[PDB]
């Protein structure tokens, strides 16, 4: 199926407490493979996946270099953004950036992106055509104009349609055992006793990859979306994910309820019943 390579950058200013915090993580699909933490000992881009580990010195020196560059721009940006908004020196503010590339089942470029936020909110973004921008507000306009004048979008398009997708492909091979795998959910049902006339019926999805999943509870074949407790997809910490959905059943009515699991690691959708 389709695949992605995404880099996530978080810049946090620390008025008084040294330089700003800079974090950079990289993902291929739902699997992180590298990290940089302005606080960490190394000051290098580091591995976080077993496959990227034997990449080479040239690769690690190059990536270390660029993430240190990304870092600088972001320290600078922090100052520039305080000015655009006439914000005070003592304020602690956030900047986030995400960029990456997708390829289809054919491994050919599909789409690219570059998202930038200030204070957990849209600041400026590359449009889907990779030539123009969408500046959220009046302050972001100045950046829009700046990058437009500097053909920033062309060299960005160059990377996302070339180096990005061609490297995603490289990684998909370097860790084809990790990245070309799907762990189908390990499912089951539990049944507790809330009171004497009610009971909790919980459907479980465990140890699955990738993250995308659908759990739905049904009464008499009729979806209970409005009466289901659905928790967000969390990480098992071992590279797989978990999830669960619960309904409250008027005792005896257990027969009427079924959990439905959809995951790409399944041949058929699963229909679970308490029986």
């Amino acid at each position: 199926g389709s695949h992605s390579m995404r880099y996530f950058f978080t810049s946090v200013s620390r008025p008084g407490r040294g330089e700003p915090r800079f974090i950079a993580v990289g993902y291929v699909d739902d699997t992180q493979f590298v990290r940089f933490d302005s606080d960490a000992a190394s000051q290098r881009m580091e591995p976080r996946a077993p496959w990227i580990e034997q990449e080479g010195p040239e690769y690690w020196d190059g990536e270390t270099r660029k993430v240190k560059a990304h870092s600088q721009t972001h320290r600078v940006d922090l100052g520039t953004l305080r000015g655009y908004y006439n914000q005070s020196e003592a304020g602690s503010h956030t900047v986030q950036r995400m960029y990456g590339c997708d390829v289809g089942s054919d491994w050919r470029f599909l789409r690219g992106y570059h998202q930038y936020a200030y204070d957990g909110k849209d600041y400026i973004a590359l449009k889907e055509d990779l030539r123009s921008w969408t500046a959220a507000d009046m302050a972001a306009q100045t950046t829009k104009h700046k990058w437009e004048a500097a053909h920033v979008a062309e060299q960005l398009r160059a990377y996302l349609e070339g180096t990005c997708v061609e490297w995603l492909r490289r990684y998909l091979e370097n860790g084809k055992e990790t990245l070309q795998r799907t762990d189908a959910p390990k499912t089951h049902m539990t049944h507790h006793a809330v009171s004497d006339h009610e009971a909790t019926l919980r459907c479980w999805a465990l140890s699955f990859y990738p993250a995308e999943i659908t759990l739905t509870w049904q009464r008499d074949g009729e979806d209970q979306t409005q009466d289901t407790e659905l928790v967000e997809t969390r990480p098992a910490g071992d590279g797989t994910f978990q999830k669960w959905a619960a309904v409250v059943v008027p005792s005896g009515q257990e027969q009427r309820y079924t959990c439905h699991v959809q995951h790409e690691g399944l041949p058929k959708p699963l229909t679970l019943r308490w029986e």
């Binding site: 990536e63 660029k66 960029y99 950046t143 960005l156």
Partner: peptide
């Protein structure tokens, strides 16, 4: 593989 150049806002 990161983007080689990162322009300022």
């Amino acid at each position: 593989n990161l983007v080689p150049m990162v322009a300022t806002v």
